[PDB]
Design an enzyme around this catalytic site. Sequence first.
Site, mmCIF file in Angstrom:
data_model
loop_
_atom_site.group_PDB
_atom_site.id
_atom_site.type_symbol
_atom_site.label_atom_id
_atom_site.label_comp_id
_atom_site.label_asym_id
_atom_site.label_seq_id
_atom_site.Cartn_x
_atom_site.Cartn_y
_atom_site.Cartn_z
ATOM 1 N N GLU A 8 75.045 46.487 48.622
ATOM 2 C CA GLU A 8 75.083 45.199 47.933
ATOM 3 C C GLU A 8 74.908 43.973 48.831
ATOM 4 O OE1 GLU A 8 78.588 47.090 46.704
ATOM 5 O OE2 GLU A 8 78.522 46.210 44.694
ATOM 6 N N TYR A 295 84.229 40.880 54.102
ATOM 7 C CA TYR A 295 83.917 40.311 52.793
ATOM 8 C C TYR A 295 84.935 39.251 52.374
ATOM 9 C CZ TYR A 295 80.509 41.024 49.056
ATOM 10 O OH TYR A 295 79.553 40.912 48.289
#
Length: 552
Positions: A8, A295
């Site tokens: 992703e 992240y």
Amino acid sequence: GKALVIVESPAKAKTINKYLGSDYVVKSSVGHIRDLPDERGALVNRMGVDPWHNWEAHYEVLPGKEKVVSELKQLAEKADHIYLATNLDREGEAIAWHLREVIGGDDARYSRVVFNEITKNAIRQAFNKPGELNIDRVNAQQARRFMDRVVGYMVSPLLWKKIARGLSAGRVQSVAVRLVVEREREIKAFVPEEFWEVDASTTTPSGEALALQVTHQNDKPFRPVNKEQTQAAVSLLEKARYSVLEREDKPTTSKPGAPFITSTLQQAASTRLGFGVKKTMMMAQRLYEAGYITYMRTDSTNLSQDAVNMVRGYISDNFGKKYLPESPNQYAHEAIRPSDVNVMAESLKDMEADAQKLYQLIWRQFVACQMTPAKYDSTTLTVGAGDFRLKARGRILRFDGWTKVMPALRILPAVNKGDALTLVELTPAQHFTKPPARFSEASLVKELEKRGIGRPSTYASIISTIQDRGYVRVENRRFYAEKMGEIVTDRLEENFRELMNYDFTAQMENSLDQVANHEAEWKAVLDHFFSDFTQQLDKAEKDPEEGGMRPN
DNA sequence: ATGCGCT
Ligand SMILES: [Hg+2]
Ligand SMILES: [Hg+2]
Ligand SMILES: [Hg+2]
């Protein structure tokens, strides 16, 4: 031939391609790549899903992923076996499903792999014991996505007709506003209560100063409500004999907090750096893309074993044993932390000053989390004076522990039980209870996550939508409900009680998990949902006298 | 002439 791996996040790809080198071709979808654009054909065309035709849908590439999809197309040629490596949750599972249907080919040409960490001890096991995509997981996400669609595209129009054009309603959106509306009404109805406090300055048998607070009178909590009562009491305290009753010395500790998650990072950046939610995420984004942290979107405060060994290793060399706990500190994606503890904020000369400040906040929280507790000697003095009881509390730092890396920014004189105290002066103080605090951007996010209402990647977005829609406004970095927000919130609560209940999301998550665990079928679950929803919608469409939605 | 939530 060469294997094609798809993840992703681009940053994560570049990192994977490394711990794997050539022979493989790593790339990223950079998001979803595809999504949505009795009965009414126009409404169905607009929604992209047909509730009246067994939920047939019409997905279509995002107007900004054409290239990504295209460049991913040709790459599928020189590829032997395609490895979908998106997140294991249902959203990631769905991105994998869409990739597989946009790239085409045969099922056997596709494989599903999950990367634990960047370590080779993970990127290896990834291809070791893989599997394929879970249809149940995919359908669970389709069910959520469709329920959110129906509500927004079918309720909003009702608002346009009954209230005003440009209005919107949504599972997450509308309860966020409700929270602000309820706090607003809470504040406007608040009536401050007056209460008084009395403190007494005294001298020990030695001559030292001792400040005391009056706690009881005739054995009841001392809390006068007016000046008159406060005076009646001061008159007695002025003539009373003061003597020490008890001196309780006790060792007390302070404990570090958990490493950051998206919500807490936003709150900490807001309280210690004055950063707004959107800004904090912008800086965090820069830091992640430059490989300094993990992240920025996460709801877990967990830490890998390696992360834990890395930090203990650092604490051990830089602070000593007294700061390193016997064994790792325990507490209830991974948590947001530096990718390398050895990297100080001052060495990121390629980052803006604010990004360095955010990094430093993340760093210190991560290192303090694994250090030892702070130790204090707390003293509590009990004093008697006539029918009154007075108290004094003190504290002396004995060991900073974790506060060494995360600093914040008391000495009770020696006296023994039975000692007399000499009164110097009595100071009465008038006070008033205060109304509940107004929400701040981070503060509302905190409330949303507490009730599991939003998602790390959507909190910021939510805070903006409710403002642009005109439901609430921000002033002095605090939320205020707008009249329109109250109007819509009352209408929605009147005609869509279920949807407006804070736990609607939690209840939805349970049903979605059942679909993911073969304990329910997705179309059946959507059918039940839709039946209830349409029952409410149709009723709302009627005239106010028949139970319909009140127009403004 | 038009609306959701998530990555
Ligand atoms: Hg997107
Ligand atoms: Hg901790
Ligand atoms: Hg986006």
